[PDB]
Amino acid sequence: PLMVKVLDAVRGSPAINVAVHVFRKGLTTEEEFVEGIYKVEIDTKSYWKALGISPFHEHAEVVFTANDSGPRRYTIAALLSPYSYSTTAVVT
Amino acid sequence: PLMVKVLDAVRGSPAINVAVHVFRKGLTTEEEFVEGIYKVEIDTKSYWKALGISPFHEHAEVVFTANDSGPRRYTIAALLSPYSYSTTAVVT
Amino acid sequence: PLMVKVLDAVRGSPAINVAVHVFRKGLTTEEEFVEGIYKVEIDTKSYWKALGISPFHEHAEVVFTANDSGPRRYTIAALLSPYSYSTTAVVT
Amino acid sequence: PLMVKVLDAVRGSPAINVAVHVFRKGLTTEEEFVEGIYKVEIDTKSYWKALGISPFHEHAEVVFTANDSGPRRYTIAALLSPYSYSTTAVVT
Amino acid sequence: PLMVKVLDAVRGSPAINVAVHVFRKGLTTEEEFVEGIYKVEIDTKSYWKALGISPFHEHAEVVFTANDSGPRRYTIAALLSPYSYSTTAVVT
Amino acid sequence: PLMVKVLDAVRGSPAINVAVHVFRKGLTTEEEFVEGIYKVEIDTKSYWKALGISPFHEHAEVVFTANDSGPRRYTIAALLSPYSYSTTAVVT
Amino acid sequence: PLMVKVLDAVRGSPAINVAVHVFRKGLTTEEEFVEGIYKVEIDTKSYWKALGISPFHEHAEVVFTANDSGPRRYTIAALLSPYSYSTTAVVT
């Protein structure tokens, strides 16, 4: 008897992000997994990944140049931050 | 008997993002998984990925130049942040 | 008898991020795992990862240059910080 | 009889981040694990990781140059810091 | 009979980060573990990790130069520091 | 009968970070462990780690130069320091 | 009968970081352990660690130069120092 009870009763106006996971049981491999339930990615950069089997195997002169240089701006007042009866403001 | 009960009773006007996962049981491979349930990606950059088997296998001179340089701006007052009885404002 | 009870009763307007995991039981491999339940990544950079089997195996002169140099700005008043009856403001 | 009770009763408007894990039981391998429940990563940099089997195996002259030099700024008033009845402000 | 009771009753508006783990039982390997429950990483840098089996095995002259030199600034008034009935302010 | 009771009753608005772990029972290997429950890492640098089996095995002249020299500044008024009815301010 | 009772009753608004661990029972190996419950690491540097089996095994002239020399500044008014009814201020 696996019984899970979450926020059974609520009297009011809450701000919530419920996440309930009940479980009863190739160069890259992933199996039987839960990812990105609430994963906020901002300005995420992946250049060379999982290129493959025998990549640049022989006489492969490579010139990798990664330049992350820009007037970039990110302004998030509330990230994964539920708020009740409040005042949120990005004043810019 | 697997019983899961979430937010059974609510008295009011809540702001919520419910996520309930009940489970009872090639160069890149993924199996039996839950991804991107609430994954917010902003300015995500992937250049060279899973190129393939035997990519640039022989005498492959490569000149990779990744330049992320721009007047880019991102303004999100509330990201995955449910809010009740509140004031949200991006004043710009 | 596995009984789990979370925030059973609430009288008011709380700000919450509930995470409940009840469980009753290739170069890179991951199995039976929970990732990114609430993982906020900001300005995350991954250059060369999981290149592959026999990458640059023979006579492979490589010139890797990673330059992270930019007028980049990130302003998050509340990250994974639920707030009730409060005042949040990014004044810039 | 495994009974877990968290924040059973609440009288008011709290700010909380509940995390409850009840459990009753390749070059890189991970199994049966919970990661990133609340992992905030900011300006995280990974250059060369899990390159592969036999990478740069023979006569591989490599010139790795990682330069992290930029006018980068990160301003987070509240990180994983739930707050009730308070005043949070990033004044810049 | 394994009974765990946390913050059973609350009368007011607290600021809390509850973490409850009840448990009743390849070059790099990790198994049966809980990581990143609340791990805040800021300006974390990993250069060469888990390169692989037989990396730079023979005649591999390598020139690794890691330069972390930038006008970088990080300002977090409250990190993993829940606060109730208070005033938090990053004035800059 | 393993009974654990934490902060059973609270009358007011405390600021707390509860951590309760009840447990009843490859070059690098870790098993059955709990890490990063509240691990705040700031400016953490790892250069060469877990390179692999037979790394630089023969005639491998290596020039490792790690230079951590930058106008870097980190200002955190409250780190893992919950505060109630107080005034926190990073004035800079 | 293993009974553990912590902060059972609280009358007021305390600032606390509770940590309760009740337990009833490869070149590098760790097993059955709890690490980083509240480990704050600041400016932590690890250069060459767990290189691997047979690293630089034969004729490996190595030039390791680690230079930690920068105008780096770290200012944390309250680290793992919960405070109630007080005034914390980083004035700089």
Residue numbers in the entry:
A (entry chain F), B (entry chain G), C (entry chain E), D (entry chain D), E (entry chain C), F (entry chain B), ...: 11 to 35, 57 to 123
Lines quoted from the article behind this entry:
Non-hereditary ATTR amyloidosis is an aging-associated disease that arises from the formation of amyloid fibrils from misfolded wild type transthyretin (TTR) protein. The protein is a 55 kDa tetramer that consists of four identical 127 residue protomers. In order to form amyloid fibrils, the tetramer must dissociate and unfold such that the unfolded polypeptide chains are able to reassemble into amyloid. In ATTRwt amyloidosis, amyloid deposits occur mainly in heart tissue of men, where they cause severe cardiomyopathy.
Here we used cryo electron microscopy (cryo-EM) to determine the molecular structure of a human ex vivo ATTRwt amyloid fibril. A 3D map with a resolution of 2.78 Å, based on the 0.143 Fourier shell correlation (FSC) criterion, was reconstructed with the cryo-EM images. The density map showed two separate continuous density regions, which after structure modelling, corresponded to the residues Pro11 to Lys35 and Gly57 to Thr123, respectively. Between the two regions from position Ala36 to His56, the electron density map was not resolved indicating structural movement or inhomogeneity. Two major hydrophobic clusters are detectable. The C-terminal region of the peptide creates a probably water filed cavity, lined with polar and ionic residues Thr59 to Lys80. Glu63 builds a salt bridge with the Lys35 of the n + 1 Layer, which would stabilize the first region with the second.
